[PDB]
Design a protein around this ligand. Structure first.
Ligand code: CLA
Ligand code: CLA
Ligand code: CLA
Ligand code: CLA
Ligand code: CLA
Ligand code: CLA
Ligand SMILES: CC(/C=C/C=C(C)/C=C/[C@@]12O[C@]1(C)C[C@@H](O)CC2(C)C)=C\C=C\C=C(C)\C=C\C=C(C)\C=C\[C@@]12O[C@]1(C)C[C@@H](O)CC2(C)C
Ligand SMILES: CC(/C=C/C=C(C)/C=C/[C@@]12O[C@]1(C)C[C@@H](O)CC2(C)C)=C\C=C\C=C(C)\C=C\C=C(C)\C=C\[C@@]12O[C@]1(C)C[C@@H](O)CC2(C)C
Ligand SMILES: CC(/C=C/C=C(C)/C=C/[C@@]12O[C@]1(C)C[C@@H](O)CC2(C)C)=C\C=C\C=C(C)\C=C\C=C(C)\C=C\[C@@]12O[C@]1(C)C[C@@H](O)CC2(C)C
Ligand SMILES: CC1=C(/C=C/C(C)=C/C=C/C(C)=C/C=C/C=C(C)/C=C/C=C(C)/C=C/C2=C(C)CCCC2(C)C)C(C)(C)CCC1
Ligand SMILES: CC1=C(/C=C/C(C)=C/C=C/C(C)=C/C=C/C=C(C)/C=C/C=C(C)/C=C/C2=C(C)CCCC2(C)C)C(C)(C)CCC1
Ligand SMILES: CCCCCCCCCCCCO[C@H]1O[C@H](CO)[C@@H](O[C@H]2O[C@H](CO)[C@@H](O)[C@H](O)[C@H]2O)[C@H](O)[C@H]1O
Lengths: 215, 194, 74, 164, 70, 41, 193
């Protein structure tokens, strides 16, 4: 069903019912990296969180980038916006990353143990009454509860849609950031600047006219 | 019950209708376990009672003209000679902070880790209104409702001071001096665009 | 012979680490060092052979005798 | 200047040896016509040579008493002073390729033992099988550490012994 | 620092620490004569007397290389 | 010619094809990248 | 038990839930043999009790203004005339070191190699709180918890002094004078980059 290549044999470790029950299953594994089932389950958790950080990241690059080229903001380019906003600030970057890795590390190490055993953090006496809402759902990577304020989870149909819409906007955003890094090395301009350069001259201004598709 | 907070919505089954301040408002299912809900009914009242004391102290400073709530700890830095009703009190910061660490934990440890009760029957009711016969859940409802208003209003003090830098009455006089030009949109903080 | 001192038959055997790190420890080595000569000779040639290099490594750098490290063939 | 050293863009015996080599090439160049390919070859040798000295000084290689590029094989003295490309980058650029060849050769031997006679398919390499494991072994550290967690990487004491 | 007090008191110290404190922990052709109550014969006394003298000579030597730098 | 492709898939013939592959790859890289002593960018 | 130290983790079977200060925290399986664990429960309390006495002596010097914990043995070198509460004590280093070798081993040998007990019933309880009836394991838990905090805090004194060279209150006043510029990252020691 709906493979990435319509003629390929889909590898058999994406056609098991514990793998066809998964968002974004287009039969794409040409290295066989997820043949082991827990390695598939671990890499499925890596893809959800590489994509959600990328969707939050890319919307932190082009949404203040498109709303800067259209006026009403003064946010600079994303490859220079780390240099600024530390002088409109209070700590050194060392004094800021260490508090970051404390705050992020308490979260990630709780998600670590919930992957190892689902419903880990739902055991009583963990938190100060807040640990009840942290059992996740029956499938991991989708916690809900306090992570679903609008309450879109409790459908059981339209639900595989919101899964597959998250992954496809997520996989597009991961290619967008791998875009953004590559279209900053190769030309040094902005990503909206590269979009403006491609729209004013598509047939001469592209990656065929720089030194990185070199023969 | 007495309310629905969004009319037409079902009520959560894990919120009993007997409880004071109930509306069925838990869209997160955040109190589905009974021990978590029992801790939360203890903690909402105590957050509500301290905020009612908090929001009254923030208003009565500006009602009596002693600066505002933000500037009352501006003697520990940039000077000294703390005031209360205009009367001097010759305490520095590092002494009363130690006084309010020992004496408050002495009142916390009698309250918190000596049970879980939040309406203690006895010495905390001097005049005597709620004898738990009939008028209890009515007045407990009012303690929640005035308490929930206070927690909103204190959160409406911190966000108002983070945006405009002015106190409660100092900008309520401005919203009354300019109804359409002294609200949360004329500053370029709460609405970033227009 | 005098009631004080350490017995070799109680220092080897009693140094057995818990959780099976080193098997049964050094238990029973004493009768295989005392009775065996090639074990005693093999330890002695290991010790003397390293403190023969230690003689050599510490006499070019720290020459202990007068007007050595001026006589170069010596 | 880390361990008694100096940058090769700053030392002078390095530049003296560059001028030593280009002297030897030019006195070898003098025997030929300026159109001749034995002189075209030597001038192409120089422009490979002079760019080589330019590129070693560009990377900030460390010279010493002899004016030669000295390497620093310690992280913490290469990460701190900007020299991870000397050893610390190719020590993982190698160990990717090294365990790659190990893993492809591992997976070819594991997936040949369940056969009729596996010794025949070590002479006659199953090329459609071997190239298939060759391409798909490109995420071998991602596959090995998952195999490391099970207990399927290390075979137990079924292994052969003499007299324990 | 004194010549006669320190070496006397150090040996008096270490013939008391094995006499009154380390009595049982040390105990875990007939010369052993327990005529003190728990075996404090000359073999045990010359062991704690070698420790009593040697640390006392260490103290008097450290007190005399112009002074202490510890 | 299936038997002829078995011969091409023996051990020394794949060895002498893959070593011309791997040397011939490193020869072309060391032509178009002259003298890589240190990893540049 | 009363705690899990990493919620969702299994508990080690060789840590009994009866023991005070238990959380199941032994990721090394470092006390799997019972004699090793029995020595460790003796040694955690004594490390905890001496550190609670250690961390109080490091604070109360700076709370009373006598320099800090690092500079209190700076009279044996670079001078003399040791102080305590401001009061002089005319002892050099080489006498009190011999006093604290004999008298402390006289208290160690009564403690250590005369049993293995770590909560001695009797003369070490003057007022009388834990009569081992019901309130024992509660107060033993608090002796562990305040004790474990002290061992962290003393390790938080040595690493703080190895990094910045300042005492406990002398840099706690600096973290309060600069919340974002007087922490463990502004020095080029704890975070190297
Ligand atoms: C790092 C992010 C990341 C991660 C962890 C995954 C992980 C996964 N993807 Mg996914 N994917 C990603 C990015 C990622 N993808 C991007 C950006 C796209 C768009 C091109 C896709 C498109 C995609 C499709 C269309 C499908 C998958 C599928 C899968 C699953 C099986 C494949 C596998 O073993 O990959 C494991 C891979 C890793 C753990 C990391 C590999 C990193 C490599 C070495 C770097 C490659 C760089 C690149 C060449 C440039 C697995 C859960 C299949 C699936 O979900 O079915 C179950 C499937 O059909 N993915
Ligand atoms: C921190 C204060 C606090 C706490 C502990 C509670 C606790 C509770 N409220 Mg309550 N409430 C509060 C403030 C609080 N409230 C305020 C300020 C309002 C007015 C806006 C209300 C309005 C309200 C209604 C209308 C109802 C409740 C109800 C409840 C009960 C079940 C819902 C639940 O699990 O909430 C647990 C809540 C928390 C643990 C707080 C979590 C806060 C998160 C982590 C961040 C929030 C950020 C904030 C929005 C902006 C900053 C529970 C006893 C229901 C009930 O039966 O009443 C007893 C009900 O019907 N509350
Ligand atoms: C220093 C003495 C002391 C001690 C020992 C306690 C002890 C206690 N207090 Mg208490 N309290 C104190 C001082 C003290 N308090 C003071 C001085 C005040 C007035 C300012 C209060 C106000 C207070 C309230 C209003 C409540 C308690 C509660 C409690 C109990 C819950 C224990 C707990 O969960 O620990 C947690 C330990 C902490 C130190 C709390 C952490 C800090 C909180 C989260 C404040 C941060 C708020 C901030 C906006 C949230 C972060 C931002 C976020 C939105 C991203 C416990 C008995 C709660 C209760 O009854 O149950 C309760 O509802 N106390
Ligand atoms: C035999 C092993 C060895 C030895 C002798 C040294 C020796 C040294 N290292 Mg080092 N180092 C090593 C292995 C070693 N390193 C390894 C395997 C790592 C991990 C990748 C590091 C990481 C490391 C760091 C991060 C730092 C050192 C530093 C130092 C210096 C102190 C000294 C020259 C430090 C330095 O530059 O001096 C303070 C320093 O910052 N090293
Ligand atoms: C040297 C002091 C010391 C000692 C002997 C112990 C001993 C013990 N602890 Mg304990 N602990 C200590 C300090 C110590 N702790 C500190 C400082 C903390 C706070 C961080 C804790 C927090 C703690 C928890 C939360 C728990 C224990 C538990 C235990 C018991 C089983 C674990 C074990 O085998 O540890 C043996 C430990 C050692 C032999 C120390 C080894 C130190 C290594 C060699 C180097 C460490 C370097 C250091 C990290 C940095 C420098 C055992 C009685 C468990 C228990 O049941 O409690 C009784 C338990 O749940 N401990
Ligand atoms: C002299 C002397 C002697 C003979 C011992 C002997 C002993 N000590 Mg000890 N100790 C001494 C001085 C001495 N200590 C001093 C001066 C201090 C304070 C700095 C300590 C602090 C100390 C601690 C904190 C611990 C010991 C422990 C032990 C025992 C192992 C053993 C009985 C350990 C113990 O009780 O057994 C494990 C233990 O945990 N001692
Ligand atoms: C996480 C991520 C990016 C997150 C970025 C963030 C948060 C950016 C943040 C910032 O910008 C802002 C907001 C503001 C700036 O001022 C500051 C910074 C801090 C800079 C990208 C992931 C990016 C992830 C990418 C690109 C992954 C690509 C992987 C691919 C294509 C792999 C495919 C395969 O592995 C499979 C699927 C199967 C195998 O069998 C076959 C192959 C082909 C090997
Ligand atoms: C706002 C607040 C809590 C808000 C929480 C809300 C709305 C949560 C709602 C939900 O959870 C439910 C219900 C159900 C879930 O399914 C969904 C959500 C939506 C998550 C608490 C504030 C609580 C606020 C409190 C307790 C404030 C106390 C303030 C004090 C004591 C002030 C003292 C001073 O002001 C004086 C007196 C004098 C000054 O000069 C000096 C100082 C010291 C500043
Ligand atoms: C930190 C510490 C021990 C830490 C050990 C830890 C965390 C071990 C944890 C683990 O083992 C477990 C639990 C389980 C294993 O599976 C895993 C690990 C992780 C291995 C002991 C400190 C113990 C620290 C102690 C005992 C400190 C005593 C200090 C004293 C007495 C100080 C005295 C002075 O300060 C004064 C009073 C005045 C000054 O002027 C002079 C002096 C003399 C300096
Ligand atoms: C076969 C066998 C045998 C033999 C063996 C041998 C031969 C051995 C050898 C061995 C050896 C040959 C060893 C060696 C060792 C060494 C060591 C182990 C070293 C160490 C070192 C150290 C420890 C040092 C330290 C230090 C430093 C660092 C420097 C300065 C000074 C000091 C001291 C500080 C026998 C007979 C038994 C029998 C059985 C088996
Ligand atoms: C009679 C009696 C008594 C007493 C006792 C006593 C008092 C004893 C003592 C004893 C003693 C008192 C002993 C001693 C000993 C000693 C010794 C035995 C020594 C040795 C020495 C040495 C060994 C040295 C060496 C050296 C030198 C030579 C010098 C220099 C240094 C050195 C080290 C080198 C009493 C009354 C109680 C009781 C009754 C009985
Ligand atoms: C997620 C984990 C990975 C995160 C990687 C973070 C990498 C970014 C670290 C900081 C960028 C490199 O650091 C380098 O530029 C910083 C920004 O000017 C400098 O930081 C400093 O620079 C200037 C002074 O020289 C000042 O204007 C800056 O306010 C100050 O922060 C550092 O002295 C320098 O070492």
């Amino acid at each position: 069903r709906q493979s990435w290549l319509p003629g390929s044999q889909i590898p058999a470790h994406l056609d098991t019912p514990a793998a066809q029950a998964l968002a974004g299953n287009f039969g794409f594994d040409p290295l066989g990296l997820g043949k082991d089932p827990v390695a598939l389950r671990w890499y499925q958790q890596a893809e959800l969180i590489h994509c959600r950080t990328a969707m939050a990241g890319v919307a932190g690059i082009l949404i203040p980038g498109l709303l800067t080229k259209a006026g009403a903001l003064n946010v600079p380019e994303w490859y220079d916006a780390g240099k600024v906003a530390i002088e409109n600030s209070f700590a050194p970057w060392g004094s800021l990353l260490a508090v970051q890795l404390f705050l992020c590390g308490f979260v990630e190490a709780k998600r670590w143990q919930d992957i190892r055993k689902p419903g880990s953090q739902g055991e009583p006496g963990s938190f100060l009454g807040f640990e009840a809402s942290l059992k996740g759902t029956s499938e991991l990577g989708y916690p809900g509860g306090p992570f679903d304020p609008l309450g879109l989870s409790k459908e059981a149909d339209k639900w595989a849609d919101w899964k597959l819409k998250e992954v496809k906007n997520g996989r597009l955003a991961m290619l967008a950031f791998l875009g953004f890094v590559a279209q900053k090395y190769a030309t040094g301009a902005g990503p909206v600047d590269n979009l403006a350069a491609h729209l004013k001259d598509p047939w001469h201004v592209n990656y065929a006219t720089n030194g990185v598709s070199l023969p | 019950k007495a309310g629905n907070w969004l009319p037409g919505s079902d009520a959560p089954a894990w919120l009993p209708d007997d409880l004071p301040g109930n509306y069925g408002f838990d869209p997160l299912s955040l109190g589905k376990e009974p021990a978590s809900l029992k801790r939360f009914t203890e903690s909402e009242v105590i957050h509500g009672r301290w905020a009612m004391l908090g929001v009254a102290g923030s208003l009565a400073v500006e009602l009596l003209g002693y600066g505002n709530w933000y500037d009352a700890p501006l003697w520990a830095v940039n000077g000294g000679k703390a005031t209360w009703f205009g009367i001097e009190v010759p305490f520095d910061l590092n002494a009363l902070l130690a006084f309010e660490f020992v004496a408050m934990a002495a009142a916390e440890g009698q309250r918190g880790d000596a049970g879980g009760v939040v309406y203690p029957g006895g010495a905390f009711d001097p005049l005597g209104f709620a004898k738990d016969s009939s008028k209890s859940g009515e007045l407990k409802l009012k303690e929640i409702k005035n308490g929930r208003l206070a927690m909103v209003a204190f959160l409406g003090f911190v966000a108002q001071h983070a945006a405009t830098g002015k106190g409660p009455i100092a900008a309520l006089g401005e919203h009354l001096a300019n109804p359409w030009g002294a609200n949360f949109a004329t500053n370029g903080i709460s609405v970033p665009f227009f | 012979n005098f009631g004080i001192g350490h017995r070799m038959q109680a220092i080897l055997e009693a140094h057995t680490p818990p959780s099976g790190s080193l098997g049964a420890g050094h238990k029973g080595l004493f009768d295989t060092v005392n009775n065996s000569l090639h074990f005693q000779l093999g330890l002695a040639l290991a010790s003397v052979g390293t403190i023969t290099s230690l003689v050599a490594q510490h006499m070019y750098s720290l020459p202990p005798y007068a007007f050595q490290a001026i006589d170069f063939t010596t | 200047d880390i361990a008694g050293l100096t940058p090769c863009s700053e030392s002078k015996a390095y530049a003296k040896l560059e001028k030593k080599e280009l002297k030897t090439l030019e006195k070898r160049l003098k025997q030929y016509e300026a159109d001749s390919a034995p002189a075209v070859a030597l001038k192409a040798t120089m422009e490979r040579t002079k760019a080589r000295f330019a590129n070693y000084a560009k990377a900030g290689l460390l010279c010493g008493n002899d004016g030669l590029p000295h390497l620093i094989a310690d992280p913490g003295l290469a990460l701190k002073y900007g020299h991870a490309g000397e050893v610390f980058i190719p020590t993982f650029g190698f160990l990717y390729v090294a365990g790659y060849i190990g893993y492809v050769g591992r997976q070819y031997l594991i997936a040949v033992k369940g056969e009729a006679k596996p010794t025949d398919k070590e002479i006659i390499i199953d090329v459609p099988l071997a190239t298939k494991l060759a391409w798909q072994g490109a995420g071998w550290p991602l596959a090995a550490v998952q195999e490391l967690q099970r207990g399927t990487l290390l075979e137990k004491e079924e292994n052969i012994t003499v007299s324990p | 620092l004194d010549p006669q007090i320190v070496i006397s008191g150090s040996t008096a110290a270490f013939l008391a620490i094995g006499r009154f404190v380390f009595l049982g922990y040390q105990r875990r052709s007939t010369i052993f004569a327990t005529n003190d109550p728990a075996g404090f014969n000359i073999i045990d006394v010359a062991g704690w007397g070698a420790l009593g003298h040697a640390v006392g000579f260490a103290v008097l030597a450290i007190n005399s290389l112009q002074g202490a730098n510890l | 010619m299936k038997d002829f492709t078995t011969y091409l898939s023996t051990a020394p013939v794949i060895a002498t094809i893959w070593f011309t592959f791997t040397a011939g790859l490193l020869i072309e890289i060391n032509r178009y990248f002259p003298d890589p002593l240190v990893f540049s960018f």
